[PDB]
């Protein structure tokens, strides 16, 4: 807003993995306020991850998120008759937002029948540096380094 | 397999597969499988010959398929022949149950003709 920045809301750590990042993930999964469904999907997906990989689900999930979170983004700008996509650095809080948003958005587009299956495979894929959410991050860096000459705009 | 002259789907449970017969819905299929003592969860490819015979005998007591199509067509023909209000709507291709035709009569009328 014009006045200035607004304080953000904290969340509680999840009861199983004691993780605030996991709680924020459940909120991204959740539709129409149906939290129980979102929690059920997330915890079922983490069981699938833990046994399809052999590791802790949370440990795989932090690896997967680190491969989705971008370091540079592009911002639209109007510069006297030529729109310029200025590359900027993503702030740490926005990195987590995009990591969780891209993970859920590209898990929703997959072909597995259930969302717990889709989310678990996205996490396993992103932890191997593949999948739709990792590609979306790659295309964001590919759009940014193609404009790193325009870093002098603001 | 073939029950009332129709080859109902082989891979589904009987309650569902029976609904592929013209004249049998969900509730009729349930009562047919209660009358003829066949479990609803049986796949029709797993129906025994005796179980299939009992189904065909109960189904024989219902008006289905071409007998039901003839009866329905005779009813519409009677309405048109006596030139009732409904019979006129049937011939004109318009809704017959008092629905408004200024908008939203596409099912009876078809695609829009701009």
């Amino acid at each position: 807003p014009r006045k200035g920045s607004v304080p953000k809301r904290d969340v509680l750590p999840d009861p199983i993995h004691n993780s605030k990042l996991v709680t924020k993930l459940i909120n991204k999964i959740m539709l129409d306020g149906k939290r129980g469904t979102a929690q059920r999907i997330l915890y079922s997906a983490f069981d699938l991850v833990e046994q399809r990989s052999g590791r802790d689900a949370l440990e795989v999930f932090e690896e997967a998120i680190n491969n989705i979170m971008p370091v540079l983004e592009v911002k639209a700008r109007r510069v006297g008759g030529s729109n310029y996509q200025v590359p900027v650095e993503v702030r740490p809080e926005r990195r987590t937002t995009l990591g969780l948003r891209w993970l859920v958005n590209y898990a929703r587009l997959r072909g597995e029948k259930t969302m717990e299956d889709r989310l678990a495979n996205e996490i396993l894929d992103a932890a191997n540096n593949t999948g739709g959410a990792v590609k979306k991050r790659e295309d964001t860096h590919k759009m940014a380094e193609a404009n790193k000459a325009f870093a002098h705009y603001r | 397999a073939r029950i009332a002259g129709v080859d109902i789907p082989r891979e589904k449970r009987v309650v569902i597969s029976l609904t592929y017969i013209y004249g049998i819905g969900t509730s009729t299929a349930q009562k047919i499988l209660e009358e003829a003592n066949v479990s609803a969860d049986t796949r029709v490819k797993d129906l025994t010959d005796d179980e299939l015979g009992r189904i065909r005998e109960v189904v024989d007591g219902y008006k289905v398929e071409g007998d039901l199509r003839r009866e329905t067509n005779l009813n519409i023909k009677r309405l048109m022949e006596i030139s009732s209000y409904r019979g006129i709507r049937h011939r004109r291709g318009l809704p017959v149950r008092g629905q408004k035709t200024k908008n939203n009569a596409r099912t009876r009328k078809g695609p829009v003709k701009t």
Partner: protein, 57 residues
């Protein structure tokens, strides 16, 4: 004829076909619709339907 199709048994009666049970002949062969009774009574008619519905004799 040039050089399958056997005598299958389809009530029961002998027949020839390719879509392949002891008989009085003593041999065995590969073995719904009996086609319609009155099945269903015909339409009552509007007068009779009216009288029966309202009990008007």
């Amino acid at each position: 004829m040039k050089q399958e199709y056997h005598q299958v048994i389809f009530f029961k009666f002998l027949s020839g076909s390719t879509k392949t049970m002891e008989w009085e002949d003593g041999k065995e062969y590969p073995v719904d619709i009996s086609h319609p009774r009155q099945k269903f009574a015909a339409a009552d008619g509007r007068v009779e339907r009216f009288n029966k519905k309202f009990g008007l004799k």
